[PDB]
Design a protein around this ligand. Structure first.
Ligand SMILES: [Mg+2]
Ligand SMILES: [Mg+2]
Lengths: 305, 305
């Protein structure tokens, strides 16, 4: 059916949840997949998944990786990608992806690498599950599993959900990912300058006020109002404390909405929850929000042949 | 001696520590100071110190505030200044500060307003103590008290400390403040574009990896290497967790140092600890680090006559 090759990379934090990574590896292999580069799991340097040299070579070595239909799977997030950005051989990776592209998938910290690929070569990659959090969870979430294989196997596919926002249609380049990581790139060479897009954002363990602060920066930098639509994903561990006294994500949505002339849709399952979709960053998307529900139709990404 | 007028403003979070604000007011008044605009203490709207309208007018009303030698004192930080930035009458405030300037002092969230004043009119303001955290603490810290009145009363003054870094001399415009707030302005109209400066940074309850992430953005955006020197202040609530496995502020300093050709000095008491200096943002500074210690000589700011 869809037995595949996965190739691990670990540009970010040390894998503390050794149990969960080996559980993810075993689950993939029990399903008939094969996993290369399993040695990245053991690697450690302080809080990083190996030395600057080793994490860097995980990425730069992808230019020589030639097996057909290889899924490159980030192990986990944390911190560490930001240290690598200046030393990544962006041209060589962009060149590699022009023919028989690797199918590169991860989320969180990995956003920054995905962003730099976009900035340098419009190279499409997948914001979606990673080895430890998703494949290595106690149960593999079926929604996430479905949506991963849905994107990677179908040249055109549709996601749907009961989103909140105006009834609207919008079309443009799908981009975004982890909000904090996108913010961390403003002003740098790896910030994608995508206008007229569909920008999708999520985050984890950011209090609402921080989420607002970040969205407002994207607003004030002129990024939000240049898009066709904004979609908000999951904002995990973002419940009010006492001091908030009614201030919550709803307030954040209201505050940004009062400044935007373009639609903002919320409620997509995307980011760090056990339910996440897989979004090909740099692909084409058509957003349609009606009274019956929301759809996002995506095309242009590379798929398993 | 130096009995003065203070005028409160509250652009940020609701004052939950009512006890501490009234304690700060009482301490100032027991010393012979007078405090106006004491009604801002009661104000509340969700997590903010009043409605958008009310917090905004705290700032815009400063243009009509004409008493000689008025110290405008921010009550507290939190979140809220970012919501105001687009609606502040920057020109009117810049114009006000051209003659008989208000002496405006605060830290934390207030950084963003201080930044916008710099960006629009090179208007000097003071990164230093606020009503609740500093004047309203159980004891008024003598180091902080001394350094506050030191800056406000002396046209030229010198701070000294046992800083760590290369032996060096550097000269240029003093700028910076709260690191997270400075980051939140990158790409926006309120980011100061100060080259050849002395950039001083601090923060609170940011883990080291976040501190690094922010410093690296300032590095990758081209801001750090355009300065003459970088000074790091207090980084409060920034001790490692278990996962860090040796990763700490020292690592952060090392990592940035390996990328910078300009000196980076650490160890200044500046920011959120009970000991903080008061730095006039936009003033002229001469940094001198020798084997005996570090000095920073500052001039050009407005003072009490
Ligand atoms: Mg709107
Ligand atoms: Mg250096």
């Amino acid at each position: 059916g869809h037995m595949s090759l996965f190739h691990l990379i670990a540009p970010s934090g040390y894998c503390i949840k050794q149990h969960a990574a080996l559980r993810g590896i075993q689950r993939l292999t029990d399903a008939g997949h094969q996993v290369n580069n399993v040695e990245v799991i053991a690697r450690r340097c302080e809080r990083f998944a190996g030395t600057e040299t080793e994490r860097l070579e995980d990425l730069n070595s992808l230019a020589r990786l030639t097996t057909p239909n290889t899924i490159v799977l980030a192990v986990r997030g944390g911190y560490g990608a930001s240290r690598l950005l200046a030393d990544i051989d962006w041209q060589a990776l962009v060149a590699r992806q022009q023919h028989d592209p690797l199918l590169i998938c991860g989320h969180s910290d990995f956003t920054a690498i995905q962003c730099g690929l976009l900035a340098h070569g419009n190279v499409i990659t997948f914001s979606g599950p990673m080895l430890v959090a998703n494949f290595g969870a106690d149960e593999l979430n079926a929604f996430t599993e479905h949506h991963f294989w849905l994107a990677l196997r179908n040249e055109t596919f549709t996601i749907e959900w009961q989103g909140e926002g105006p009834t609207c249609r919008a079309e443009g380049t799908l981009w975004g990912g982890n909000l904090a990581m996108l913010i961390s790139l403003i002003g740098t060479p790896w910030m994608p300058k995508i206008e007229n897009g569909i920008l999708v954002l999520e985050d984890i363990n950011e209090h609402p006020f921080r989420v607002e602060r970040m969205l407002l920066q994207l607003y004030h930098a002129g990024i939000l109002p240049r898009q066709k639509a904004i979609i908000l994903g999951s904002f995990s561990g973002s419940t009010p404390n006492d001091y908030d006294a009614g201030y919550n994500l709803e307030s954040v949505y209201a505050f940004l909405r009062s400044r935007l002339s373009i639609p903002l849709i919320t409620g997509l399952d995307f980011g760090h929850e056990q339910r996440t979709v897989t979004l090909p960053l740099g692909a084409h998307a058509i957003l349609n929000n009606t009274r019956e529900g929301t759809q996002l139709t995506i095309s242009g990404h590379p798929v398993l042949k």
